[PDB]
């Protein structure tokens, strides 16, 4: 049982609490789209862990390369190159759009964003960073300074030159023009304010293509192209954080491919490592050269370490070989339709949005007031668990509670259906 | 050969340069105290990679737990606990001094420092951080802001409330009292200045027990106890960064044990993961409770991930079981004596310092002027390599060039001797 | 003549240039609503100098108290009180609304704002300051940090915690709700963004009731009451900068009286000293007491100096006795109507706004496009001068050029007419 | 009497407290070296008010020009030049050393420092400012950020890039070299630390030649020349704040003349206006030209106002004509010798320092421990007052209490003697 009192005692005595509450179970094993508790109960992992296990848990191919490298080439002095690093860097150049040529292989999402923001600052000689008021880029310094969805209070001033603009949110619009939600006009208005505040040191804009922690907010048609122009005009770089969207989850290899807008710096992390700590930034040859002339530095312990790099390469291979990007569209379609059916059945479902296998379900009291459904979101999440389905709700100011759904790209039709099943039961049990 | 032109071509075209130069070889395999190039030449790893491979490369026991977990419990939603996490946290509490009870398991050294600085700020309601002018804590925001040995120029303002004090450096003293280098008086003097600058928001002092990047600078007798008192008097926390010193390298499990001064927050990383990305912060139950009441947040993708945690546990086990801490003293003694013999043979060796298996050799032009030996340091390093020994020299302002020597705790007497051999040959070949 | 080459030579060799260009004349004397050049030509002062000479130049009553005090009580140690200081402080308490009790007598507008912002910060324990994107509060540190109409570039980062929100501008609206410019909804929207950026340290909002440098922008009906509520809800103080509006210019003693919204801190300067350097902050007894308990400090050389204080008292007396506040309405009406007649005559006049004797005329190319009239504004200003009328145009981004009209409260009907005359002639001569 | 209860009642009800306590008397008139209370008691002003009345109170010549201008040319639009402004600017160029050519005429000391720091920042493209840990430059933003003797707590973060170094203090030395207080070596040591902290944006060093608020600390022989070299080497400007030292008080027109080291920017204030608000910055033609090309802005209400400028000119005239600079030396000698005699009489006098008519007397418990005499300083100050002598003691950390003595340059031999008399009586009455 999940009740080993030695276990729970040690947890209470020796663990630092870092956000949320701990699930009241002991996870013993994981395989595919499932995690198993101490009683052997299988829990369908609809969030791919912390939205990373793109190939599900313990993917045989992944298990193999990890073995293969643990015993042959593990960690090295950061000045020493090896094959997996060069291969992964090369691969990354080949599959990202034209204009992205050179990669830096790191360990975590925050780190990747830090490395990108530092390069932007160096190459521009400037320091001001603009992000979305509902963003999430990480817990470390610069990354947290550009993170507005949470964590800004009680921990001292943020980095100097931090600005946020509102993110385009079609579900709950706030900027109208001619009895119309004009999100491009909103963008124009936001920028005018920045311009007036800036000290003349705008360095970069950092953005997620789909705000995940912010509540599955997809940047609408033509927004990105518009943003990139605002940047170009100001001599700013555009940094695209594809930690959650990259590596086939939205139905394209990279979300940026959908819009055809290529960023100056692209960052990747969660999905790329598929559960293991591996991250990266990819930039153009011109930007890298200048950063280099300027003495760019981002020297860490695990930068260019062979093992993680070998893992990343394998992940790319399987995704490509097994056409998991296409699969994301097919299963996403199936999942999306199911969600829409639930919304037909239940008034508490106010919206279903997202793309491919990155979907969001917004819980509301009134599908007209779109009044946020406080508490409902949480019992639902609770019943899901009992029902055997791991869900994750994000709750932000002035919005309804949002379920972030992101199953493995290797998820099955049957699994999708089970999840749909369990979710329906949880909602009716919760009302 | 190391000359695969496809390889070097891809490296040049697709890699972001991040500090230094790339070694002109292709590392294909690694085992024990050695790395092997493409021609199969064995290079003795006197830096344990990037000072992390405590058990050398590809340690069978490590290879096994990694296999064991890759296929059984890999990565999880951050709210889900598992056995390796609770076991590692518990172990960490049991082997660190009394006053360190609760752990947070992360991925990198910088992250660990960020998590610690954020907790300090939260719990004190303050934001100013003091470090050593020769420190190195990481590349991300807060960590870099507290890093003064390098990286402060051309990348915008540092975090608000950043201060540094000089580190006690016996080899090249600068503060005398009564014809005596009074490093405690220096400490007093440094603090008075801080006090005068502070806005009344001193939150913490962050320090390495032995400044590694700063040039193997060991805090002298009674310094630490003195520092901790300066902190206590100011209501500041003392954060000890044991990324390089922790886990038996100095001859004690933790450097802080030698002085008997226990920090409020202890951070670990490199050695703990033994090449893999795993890091941690350990704090007292009182500090954790308050951070918790205050809503502390440090939620990342890989926090509490089972695989790395399982690796960390194994590393602790082997170190303990094979008495590798004691071994550090025995081999360190042997290595130290060899270095002293070289210094007898060569005038260019100005100092040999450090502890256990974290040693430093300062290259000088004149062992009286102690004039820094520019360039000499670099040919030596160069010949070492040709000779088949991987060394690392750090060069800081107003100091001679320093070789940072840190072989695996599992290093052999024969290996130590080979290294001593190769080093002697490299010096005579270089003069 | 205005051409003394010794004069112009010395000006060029020994004067620091600090903004704008120097008028090509030598002002020798001033009296009433006029300044006189070296040829004796009289220039009608429609800006009361730098918008300060409320009683016109060289007001006999002012000339007398200045004599009276220069020879009897001039400057003192800042711990020494005297009658004019206590009398002026008392008077200020008696004529400002209930809730404003205690005054601090300083020298300049910027200083007054600094003293107010410092008190706000002290009493709240916070540091973030919000202002209008088109504001003007001064050239010194905090004041400049809260100044967004100009001066933010090329001089380093601004104060930490600086935010701006757009000012309500009816002439050129940008926020619509239901085909309507909803400036209260804009206010709500602005604040939501602040809230998301804030580190949880909102200390105060600083505002001008009528943005003078920003282009004579009057806060519309119900705005202020709304702003004060946003502040109250956030535990922020509202600081009202009445440097240009205070002391009867808008037709009320204080602009804040019109709206019936009383600020936590009121600052005054230009008009209060009537050309001489005198400024002040007035706050409630509760705020002063706490600032005091908290050790508030604002100790300068001329704080509480008797001479300026005696001047300020006299100015208040004459304004009251000669009913100059009412006069401001009567002459303002006359001036406003004249301006409206010109706008009938000339398409280039796009708007006439303001209150009492603080009026603005916005020059436009097309009274529909409301396209800004670049250059036109400047010849007009130029011809005015030749015609013998001193005007001042402020030109801000995305707005037409604006003439800031503010004659002395003692201005005559005839003078108003002359100005109207000269202005009409200048416009036709300039097109 | 000084007891008008209406007066004291109004003071209590309507005055903001801003530091210290109010003297329990009502000052009614002032003339020469004396101030008179309500009972007509004459108080000898040994601090020239707030160290400004260089020509004593109500100087007939000053009274006259003030009359002369109040009635003829008072205040003007800031773009309008007049004779007093050009004359004063020209005069300032002629009497300051070669290299100081162009002046900016403002109102207060803080403002003058702000204008100088802003110019330094503009012209260097940098933002970091270094000052002395015991400095005093003003209460506004930048000025306060560079002020370390007091006021840094409880009012939010300081300006970004603020650093302090210890000031050379011969009375209580803390940096020895070869059993010697080597203040140049201290300077070297201080700078090394700065260099290590700097983000590579050192803009200027701001300093008082004699730290007045800091406790009458004179920069020792060769210090300044040394400082200026540290600046030059770093591409930093040296800003000299001569608010208390300028205009003949130290026995030279400007303190900087004594050392023969000319600053890049010189600021003046208190003494220049002789009780009235007038201040200035003087810089070289090269610096002004570049600031100008760069768009320097410092546009205030009273910049270039004729009245104050006319006052400043008169003050310069009298000082020169009546050889008040020489007088400062003669009377200073007399005052200094008297102080030394007291120190012979009383063990509580630990030091007498300063220059010309800017002298300091440090009160100590033990003339060996040099233990600070807490409380003694205050009764002495108290008895002085009763005795009829206005003194001012500054009390800083780790120092004895200091009397800042600065009588009018027009002080008489008899007055000096009276002061010496009263001071002796106060000390014996206080022990
Ligand atoms: C003492 C210390 N703390 C923290 C860190 C940061 O660790 P990460 O780089 O994994 O975040 C380092 C890095 N060590 C440097 C980094 O590279 N080589 C070194 O000697 C370090 O030496
Ligand atoms: C878009 C995005 N970027 C960067 C990061 C930072 O990654 P690390 O935590 O590995 O540094 C996150 C984290 N994801 C959050 C973190 O936890 N859950 C999330 O949804 C993220 O969502
Ligand atoms: C050296 C110096 N510089 C600048 C200033 C600022 O002048 P303002 O106060 O006029 O802006 C002061 C103030 N002198 C302090 C202030 O009060 N008493 C003193 O001894 C000063 O001593
Ligand atoms: C609203 C307001 N507040 C404060 C100030 C600062 O006053 P000082 O310049 O005296 O410090 C100004 C300056 N007025 C500007 C400054 O010059 N012309 C103007 O219209 C102002 O308009
Ligand atoms: K590495
Ligand atoms: K996790
Ligand atoms: K005063
Ligand atoms: K003026
Ligand atoms: Na590409
Ligand atoms: Na412990
Ligand atoms: Na009142
Ligand atoms: Na000169």
Measured between beta carbons, the chain D residues lying within 8 angstroms of C87 are 10
Instruction: Count Cβ neighbours within 10 Å for each residue of C137-165 and write b for 16 or more, e otherwise.
Output: bbbbbbbbbbbbbbbbebbbbbbbbbbbb
Instruction: Count Cβ neighbours within 10 Å for each residue of C61-81 and write b for 16 or more, e otherwise.
Output: bbbebbbebbbbbbbbbbbbb
Q: How far apart are CA D278 and CA D302, in angstroms?
A: 9
Q: What is the DSSP letter of D97?
A: P
Q: How far apart are CA D263 and CA D231, in angstroms?
A: 10
- Cα of D405 from ligand 3 centre, angstroms: 15
Catalytic positions of B, written as ranges: 136, 208, 241, 244, 270, 404
A199:C148 CB<8 A: no
Phi, psi of A128 (to 5 degrees): -80, 135
Contact C245, C390 (CB under 8 A): no
Chains that touch D (3 or more CB pairs under 8 A): B, C
Half-sphere exposure of A398 (CA within 13 A, CB side): 14
Best residue in A112, A125, A156, A283 for a mutation probing chain B (most B CBs within 10 Å) = A156
Q: How far apart are CA C422 and CA C427, in angstroms?
A: 9
Q: Which two tokens stand for residue B201?
A: 């928001």
| Reduced 3-state DSSP string for chain A | CCCCHHHHHHHHHHECCCCCCCCCCCCCEEEECEEECCCCCEEEECCHHHHCCCCCECCHHHHHHHHHHHCCCCCCCCCCCCHHHHHHHHHHHHHCCCCCCEEEEECCHHHHHHHHHHHHHHHHCCCEEEEECCCCCCCCHHHHHCCCCCCCCCCCCCCCCEEEECCCCCCCCCCECCCCECHHHHHHHHHHHHHHHCCCCEEEEEECCEECCCCCEECCCCHHHHHHHHHHHHCCEEEEECCCCCCCCCCCCCHHHHHCCCCCEEEECHHHHCCCCCEEEEECHHHHHHHHHCCCCCCCCCCCCHHHHHHHHHHHHHHHHCCHHHHHHHHHHHHHHHHHHHHHHCCCEEEEEEECCEEEEEEEEECCCCEECCCHHHHHHHHHHHHCEECCEECCCCCCEEEEECCCCCCCHHHHHHHHHHHHHHHHHHC
CB of A275 sitting under 6 A from ligand 2: no
- The dihedral through the CA atoms of A129, A133, A137, A138 has a sign that is positive
Domain boundaries C27-58+323-431, CATH class: alpha beta
Q: How far apart are CA C262 and CA C257, in angstroms?
A: 7
Choice among A102, A121, A126, A136 that is catalytic: A136
Choice among D136, D218, D264, D362 that is catalytic: D136
Q: Which two tokens stand for residue C136?
A: 């003007």
Contact A272, A284 (CB under 8 A): no
CB atoms within 10 A of CB B347: 13
CB pairs under 8 A between C and D: 382
Q: In which element (H, E) is residue B122 found? A: helix B109-124
Half-sphere exposure of C143 (CA within 13 A, CB side): 30
Q: Is B160 helix (H, G, I), strand (E, B) or coil?
A: coil
Q: How far apart are CA A325 and CA A332, in angstroms?
A: 11
Measured between beta carbons, the chain B residues lying within 8 angstroms of A243 are 301
Ligand 4 pocket mutation pick from C20, C117, C269, C308 by most atoms within 8 angstroms of CB = C269
B397:D196 CB<8 A: yes
Note the Cα A167 to chain centre separation in Å: 16
Q: How far apart are CA B16 and CA A102, in angstroms?
A: 5
Question: Which atom from ligand 3 is nearest to the alpha carbon of D245?
Answer: 1
Contact D41, D29 (CB under 8 A): no
Half-sphere exposure of A56 (CA within 13 A, CB side): 19
**Dihedral angle of Cα D19, D25, D27, D32, to the nearest 10 degrees:** -90
Contact C47, C392 (CB under 8 A): yes
Interior angle at CA A367, CA C196 and CA A209, nearest 5: 45
Q: Is B132 helix (H, G, I), strand (E, B) or coil?
A: strand
Q: How far apart are CA A247 and CA B109, in angstroms?
A: 27
Instruction: Count Cβ neighbours within 10 Å for each residue of A295-334 and write b for 16 or more, e otherwise.
Output: ebbbbbbbbbbbbbbbbbbbbbebbeeeebbebbbebbee
Q: In which element (H, E) is residue C297 found? A: none
C-alpha distance from D182 to closest chain C C-alpha (Å): 35
Going by C-alpha positions, the residue among A235, A211, A282, A229 that lies closest to residue A124 is A235
Give, rounded to a whole angstrom, the gap between the first and last alpha carbons of chain B: 29
> What region does C322 belong to: left with phi over 0, alpha with psi -120 to 50, or beta?
alpha
Give, rounded to a whole angstrom, the gap between the first and last alpha carbons of chain D: 29
Half-sphere exposure of D39 (CA within 13 A, CB side): 8
Going by C-alpha positions, the residue among D386, D429, D379, D275 that lies closest to residue D37 is D386
Q: Which two tokens stand for residue D171?
A: 């009375």
Q: How far apart are CA C245 and CA C356, in angstroms?
A: 10
Q: How far apart are CA B428 and CA B347, in angstroms?
A: 11
- Which segments of B362-412 does DSSP mark as H helices, in order? 376-387
Q: Is C95 helix (H, G, I), strand (E, B) or coil?
A: helix
Non-local CB neighbours of C38 within 8 Å, separated by 6+ positions: C1, C2, C3, C4, C25, C26, C28
**Pocket (CB within 6 angstroms of ligand 1):** A 299-302; B 50-51, 108-110, 113, 136-138, 208, 212-213, 241, 243-244, 269
Going by C-alpha positions, the residue among A369, D11, A194, B298 that lies closest to residue C152 is A194
Instruction: Answer yes or no: D257 catalytic.
Output: no
CB atoms within 10 A of CB C175: 25
Q: Which two tokens stand for residue A10?
A: 């040690």
Give the DSSP letter string of A233-290.
HHT-EEEEE-TTTTTTTTSSSSHHHHHT---SEEEE-HHHHTTSS-EEEEE-HHHHHH
What is the topology classification, in CATH, of domain C59-322? 3.40.640
Q: In chain C, which residues are last before a break of more than 2.5 Å from C to the next N?
A: none
Contact C216, C396 (CB under 8 A): no
Q: How far apart are CA C273 and CA D384, in angstroms?
A: 36
Going by C-alpha positions, the residue among C209, B74, D108, B10 that lies closest to residue A94 is B10
Going by C-alpha positions, the residue among B325, B328, B301, B132 that lies closest to residue B212 is B132
- The residue ranges of DSSP E strands in B278-357, in sequence order, are 279-283, 349-355
Contact B118, A155 (CB under 8 A): yes
For strand C162-165 and strand C128-132, is the pairing parallel, antiparallel, or unpaired?
parallel
Phi, psi of C249 (to 5 degrees): -65, -30
CB atoms within 10 A of CB B375: 12
Contact D390, D375 (CB under 8 A): no
Q: What is the DSSP letter of B165?
A: E
Place of tokens 């603005």: C360
Q: How far apart are CA D319 and CA A224, in angstroms?
A: 69
Ligand with smallest separation from the Cα of A143: 2
Q: In which element (H, E) is residue D256 found? A: helix D255-259
Best residue in D128, D141, D144, D196 for a mutation probing chain B (most B CBs within 10 Å) = D196
Q: In which element (H, E) is residue C307 found? A: helix C306-321
How many residues are there in chain A? 431
Measured between beta carbons, the chain B residues lying within 8 angstroms of D177 are 176
Going by C-alpha positions, the residue among D414, D431, D302 that lies closest to residue D378 is D431
Non-local CB neighbours of D43 within 8 Å, separated by 6+ positions: D25, D34, D35, D36, D37, D385, D388, D389, D390
Give every strand in the sheet of C202-207, ordered side by side.
Answer: C102-106, C279-283, C265-268, C237-241, C202-207, C128-132, C162-165
Note the Cα D113 to chain centre separation in Å: 12
Contact A373, A363 (CB under 8 A): yes
Based on its alpha-carbon atoms, the radius of gyration of chain A, rounded to whole angstroms, reads 22
D293 class by beta-carbon count within 10 Å (0-12 exposed, 13-18 middle, 19+ buried): exposed
Place of tokens 């704008």: C20
| Reduced 3-state DSSP string for D121-160 | HHHHCCCEEEEECCCCCCCCHHHHHCCCCCCCCCCCCCCC
A57:B74 CB<8 A: yes
Q: How far apart are CA A285 and CA A287, in angstroms?
A: 6
Q: Is B358 helix (H, G, I), strand (E, B) or coil?
A: strand
What residue spans define the domains of chain C? Answer: 27-58+323-431, 59-322
Q: How far apart are CA A297 and CA A217, in angstroms?
A: 34
Contact C78, D25 (CB under 8 A): no
Contact A135, A147 (CB under 8 A): yes
Give the DSSP letter string of C237-281.
EEEEE-TTTTTTTTSSSSHHHHHT---SEEEE-HHHHTTSS-EEE
A287 class by beta-carbon count within 10 Å (0-12 exposed, 13-18 middle, 19+ buried): buried
Give, rounded to a whole angstrom, the gap between the first and last alpha carbons of chain C: 29
Q: In which element (H, E) is residue A385 found? A: helix A376-387
Q: How far apart are CA A178 and CA C180, in angstroms?
A: 9
Q: Which two tokens stand for residue D97?
A: 């050393």
C-alpha distances (whole Å) from D300 to each of C50, D108, D113, D142, D234 are 8, 12, 14, 16, 32
- The residue ranges of DSSP E strands in D286-412, in sequence order, are 349-355, 358-366, 371-372, 389-390, 393-394, 401-405
Q: How far apart are CA C23 and CA C4, in angstroms?
A: 14
- The dihedral through the CA atoms of A61, A63, A65, A68 has a sign that is negative
Going by C-alpha positions, the residue among D129, B305, D8, D85 that lies closest to residue C86 is D8
Contact C262, C99 (CB under 8 A): yes
Ligand with smallest separation from the Cα of D256: 12
Q: What is the DSSP letter of C43?
A: E
Place of tokens 């829990």: A43
Helix, strand, coil distribution of chain D in percent, nearest 5 = 40, 20, 40
C-alpha distances (whole Å) from C419 to each of C34, C403, C405, D49, D244 are 11, 13, 10, 45, 46
Best residue in D277, D278, D291, D405 for a mutation probing chain C (most C CBs within 10 Å) = D277
- The dihedral through the CA atoms of B251, B255, B261, B262 has a sign that is negative
Going by C-alpha positions, the residue among C371, C372, C360 that lies closest to residue C47 is C360
Q: In which element (H, E) is residue D56 found? A: none
Ligand with smallest separation from the Cα of A257: 9
Question: Which atom from ligand 2 is nearest to the alpha carbon of A50?
Answer: 18
Q: How far apart are CA A171 and CA B148, in angstroms?
A: 47
Q: How far apart are CA D206 and CA B147, in angstroms?
A: 27
Q: How far apart are CA C381 and CA C426, in angstroms?
A: 8
Q: How far apart are CA A121 and CA A138, in angstroms?
A: 18
CB atoms within 10 A of CB A397: 12
Measured between beta carbons, the chain B residues lying within 8 angstroms of D153 are 198-200
Bridge partners of D105? Answer: D280
Q: Which two tokens stand for residue B232?
A: 């206590």
For strand B29-31 and strand B34-36, is the pairing parallel, antiparallel, or unpaired?
antiparallel
Contact A171, A96 (CB under 8 A): no
D152:B397 CB<8 A: no
Going by C-alpha positions, the residue among D114, D124, D88, D118 that lies closest to residue D103 is D88
Instruction: Count Cβ neighbours within 10 Å for each residue of C40-50 and write b for 16 or more, e otherwise.
Output: eeebbbbbbbb
Contact A26, A2 (CB under 8 A): yes
Q: Which two tokens stand for residue A165?
A: 């603009």
Q: How far apart are CA B31 and CA A75, in angstroms?
A: 11
């Amino acid at each position: 049982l999940n009740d080993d009192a030695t276990f729970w005692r040690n947890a209470r005595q020796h663990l630092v609490r870092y956000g949320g509450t701990f699930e009241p179970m002991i996870i013993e094993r994981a395989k595919g789209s499932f995690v198993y508790d101490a009683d052997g109960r299988a829990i369908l992992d609809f969030t791919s862990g912390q939205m990373s296990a793109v190939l599900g848990h313990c993917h045989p191919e992944i298990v193999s390369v990890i073995g293969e490298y643990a015993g042959k080439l593990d960690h090295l002095f950061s000045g020493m190159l090896s094959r997996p690093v060069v291969d992964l860097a090369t691969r990354l150049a080949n599959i990202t759009p034209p204009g992205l040529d050179r990669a830096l292989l790191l360990s975590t999402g925050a780190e990747s964003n830090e490395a990108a923001i530092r390069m932007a600052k160096l190459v521009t000689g400037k320091y001001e960073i603009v992000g979305f008021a509902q963003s999430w880029h990480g817990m470390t310094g610069a990354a947290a300074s550009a993170t507005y969805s949470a964590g800004r209070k009680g921990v001292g001033p943020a980095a100097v030159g931090s600005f946020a603009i509102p993110a385009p949110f079609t579900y709950r619009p706030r900027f109208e023009r001619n009895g119309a939600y004009d999100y491009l006009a909103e963008l124009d208005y936001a920028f005018d304010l920045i311009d007036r505040q800036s000290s003349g040191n705008l360095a970069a804009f950092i953005a997620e293509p789909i705000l995940s922690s912010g509540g599955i907010i997809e940047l609408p048609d033509g927004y990105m192209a518009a943003l990139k122009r605002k940047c170009e005009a100001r001599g700013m770089l555009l940094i695209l954080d594809e930690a959650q969207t990259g590596v086939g989850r939205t139905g394209t290899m990279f979300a940026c491919q959908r819009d055809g807008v290529t960023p100056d710096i692209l960052t990747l992390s969660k999905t790329l490592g598929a559960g293991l700590p591996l991250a990266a930034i990819v930039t153009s040859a011109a930007i890298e050269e200048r950063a280099h002339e300027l003495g760019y530095l981002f020297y860490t312990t695990h930068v260019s370490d062979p093992l993680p790099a070998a893992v990343g390469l394998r992940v790319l291979d399987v995704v490509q070989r097994d056409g998991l990007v296409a699969r994301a569209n097919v299963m996403g379609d199936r999942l999306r339709r199911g969600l829409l059916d639930l919304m037909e059945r239940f008034d508490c479902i106010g919206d279903v949005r997202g793309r491919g296998l990155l979907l969001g379900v917004e819980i509301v009291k009134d599908r007209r007031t779109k009044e946020p459904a406080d508490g409902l979101g949480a019992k639902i999440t609770r019943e899901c668990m009992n029902l055997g389905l791991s869900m994750n709700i994000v709750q932000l100011p002035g919005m309804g509670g949002v379920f972030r759904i992101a199953p493995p790209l290797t998820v099955s039709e049957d699994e999708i259906d089970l999840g749909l099943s369990l979710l329906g039961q949880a909602i009716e049990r919760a009302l």
